Amino acid sequence: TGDFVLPELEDVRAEAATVDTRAVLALAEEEPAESRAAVALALWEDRSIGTAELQAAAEARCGARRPRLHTFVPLYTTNYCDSECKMCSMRKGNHRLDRKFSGRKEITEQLEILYHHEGVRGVGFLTGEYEDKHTRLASAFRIGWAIRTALDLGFERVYFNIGSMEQDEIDVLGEWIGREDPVTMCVFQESYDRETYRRFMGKTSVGVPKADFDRRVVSFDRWLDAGYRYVNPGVLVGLHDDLSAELVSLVAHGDHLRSRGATADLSVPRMRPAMKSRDTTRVGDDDYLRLMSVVAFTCPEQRLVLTTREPQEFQDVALGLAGVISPGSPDVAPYRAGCEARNDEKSSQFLVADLRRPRHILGRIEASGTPVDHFVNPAG
Amino acid sequence: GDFVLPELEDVRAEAATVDTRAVLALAEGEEPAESRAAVALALWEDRSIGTAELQAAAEARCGARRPRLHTFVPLYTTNYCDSECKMCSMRKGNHRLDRKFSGRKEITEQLEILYHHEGVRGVGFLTGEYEDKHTRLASAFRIGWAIRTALDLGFERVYFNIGSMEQDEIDVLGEWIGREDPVTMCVFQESYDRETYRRFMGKTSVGVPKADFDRRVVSFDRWLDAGYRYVNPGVLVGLHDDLSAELVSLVAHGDHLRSRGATADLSVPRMRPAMKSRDTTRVGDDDYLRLMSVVAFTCPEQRLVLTTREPQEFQDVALGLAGVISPGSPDVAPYRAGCEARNDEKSSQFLVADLRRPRHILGRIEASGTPVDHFVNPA
Ligand SMILES: C[C@H]1O[C@@H](n2cnc3c(N)ncnc32)[C@H](O)[C@@H]1O
Ligand SMILES: C[C@H]1O[C@@H](n2cnc3c(N)ncnc32)[C@H](O)[C@@H]1O
Ligand code: MET
Ligand code: MET
Ligand code: SF4
Ligand code: SF4
Ligand SMILES: [Cl-]
């Protein structure tokens, strides 16, 4: 009782039909009468409102937010994984990946490189998801240590993306932090459609931990139950063919989290090349901007996260829809003091579209007129 | 480079050449002319030398060692395990065990209780043994953190007993310590007889990590290769019915480790009640004292470890043969201010024979005339 329940798409569809979409666009920095999910669907589907109009409306409805942007850099602490996501190179059945694990010395060295050589004060920690309880607890212990270590080095925001979490695993991670520390739990549902989710994440009861859709989707509710605050749901764009369904589910999830008092960021990462075993689809740039626009407009206090899954030219076009910019590499311990990060196909989760160093990406954003919180350009 | 198990037929032939009477006549510093394994077998089998006489010889030959005794208290940090040892309640297939795992808070709390309420400055960290590489590395990470945390709190000696270890696992744990830190690796072979080992630990390949006898038996060689120093081999008395074979192998293992420059303690724990899937054999007190005497005599710089698997009465009669006394409970985070430690059958590895608090066990030893290093009585 009280955890997130997936919206019924046909009911949202019926509500969406009552929405006055141009009256929605006329709203001031004001909430629509209908639910956010229904408004998001109505905007998405009303093709008499062009994407360019939606993007300008969303950039404007999110314009007064402060800070305009903050940053964090992902740090993959291992690429071992017990799960079998068919779009992901870390899937356990990819026997070609070179498996890596960072200990104390390597995590610390990487954090020091990011702080001193990239000038960032936000970091995220990633792992695979593990099957047996002891492994999940031991993983939570190590990541909790990493979070504590980053805060004590002066990082001011720490994300973690380490799989679904049960109450006892949150307890282990939580012994490393305080309920008010600036720590965000990331658990992207990938698809909120159970059939598409099964197609890529697997079936339950056969040792594949991410196959349990329900444990995954209530992880934020366990985090909030434990007293924490910051969450980051997400959809992987290119798994499910019907984006209207995913948009409804993501917005509804964000609305549920808001009702629980949470501060949420929203992620809509697009598929990148990986050692995949199932087919995915490419969502085009203008439709992807439409998705970002409708989400940012309807969820104006929930920052969209933009990453180096996108190339420089797309970042440029989309940046005013984002509240978080996250440059980095999904390779294990890939950062170097004086050159671009590694993104080796044999060890990374996927191939990035933008290999530039965070300080160069973020410095150019600042020079173009958007300050980036949690970035202190090393060039002074 | 690595340890090679001795050929028992060869040791037996050499043992037949030992002058056991002359061996007992050796002065404190003198070494026999034969290998230590053959001398130990010869003493064990020469029933014209009674056990009481061997015990006296061994207590004398170790009596000048300093410190006479040190202590450490075992702290089980989890009771999860992926292996299947049939004598042990923590085997994965024991679905009745209540599984537990200590995080940062609990490990720190337990170390504070041991330090302040028990007065100990030695601790051991224990875990199950895990199957997959990522789990084994994550375990090595957590235990390395625990070791560093104990040393920083002022523990003067740390043991760990966390399963066999490969080079990359030692690398992860070792990032937490220095080469000169007082940290002892414990890996008891349990039985050096491969048939008995298979009977209890399982067959290789079935996801049962401790079934790999050779990975286990060279763990110390990987530790020494990495530059460390302190090791603790052991045999589980009661698994193999031929104690002479186990004695030979443990002494030979200790002799190999000596030849590599290592400092070794030797453990000979006897079986205790557990939720077992296979029966063990009870070794009686005389034969067990005879085993401890022959090991302590032939390996005089290698301390035997005596634990609360033995009742108070046996500790008192055997204390002179030991160089390390290790009281505690094989339950997860079992220590508590003001009380004896928990030893619940539903969460412990086995049931101890002596539940007394370390401060009272060790205080009584000191009162009777043997100082205990790494103990500061809180009374
Ligand atoms: C950390 C996040 O990376 C995303 N993810 C997983 N596989 C891919 C891929 N091939 N390309 C882009 N992103 C991916 C998932 O959404 C996951 O949760
Ligand atoms: C930690 C050490 O405890 C021993 N061990 C395993 N099972 C039992 C038992 N039922 N009784 C006593 N000791 C046992 C093993 O020798 C192991 O390595
Ligand atoms: C590296 S993917 C993100 C974290 C975790 N493996 C998950 O899929 O939830
Ligand atoms: C708790 S038993 C000792 C540590 C490890 N489980 C092993 O058997 O080697
Ligand atoms: S998406 Fe996360 S859980 Fe799934 S295979 Fe990749 S790393 Fe493992
Ligand atoms: S002796 Fe060690 S490896 Fe074997 S079942 Fe027990 S805890 Fe696991
Ligand atoms: Cl700003």
Ligand SMILES: [Cl-]
């Ligand atoms: Cl797979």
Ligand SMILES: [Cl-]
């Ligand atoms: Cl499952």
Ligand SMILES: [Cl-]
């Ligand atoms: Cl993202």
Ligand SMILES: [Cl-]
């Ligand atoms: Cl792609």
Ligand SMILES: [Cl-]
């Ligand atoms: Cl397949």
Ligand SMILES: [Cl-]
């Ligand atoms: Cl992105």
Ligand SMILES: [Cl-]
């Ligand atoms: Cl990124």
Ligand SMILES: [Cl-]
């Ligand atoms: Cl002394």
Ligand SMILES: [Cl-]
């Ligand atoms: Cl022991």
Ligand SMILES: [Cl-]
């Ligand atoms: Cl013990």
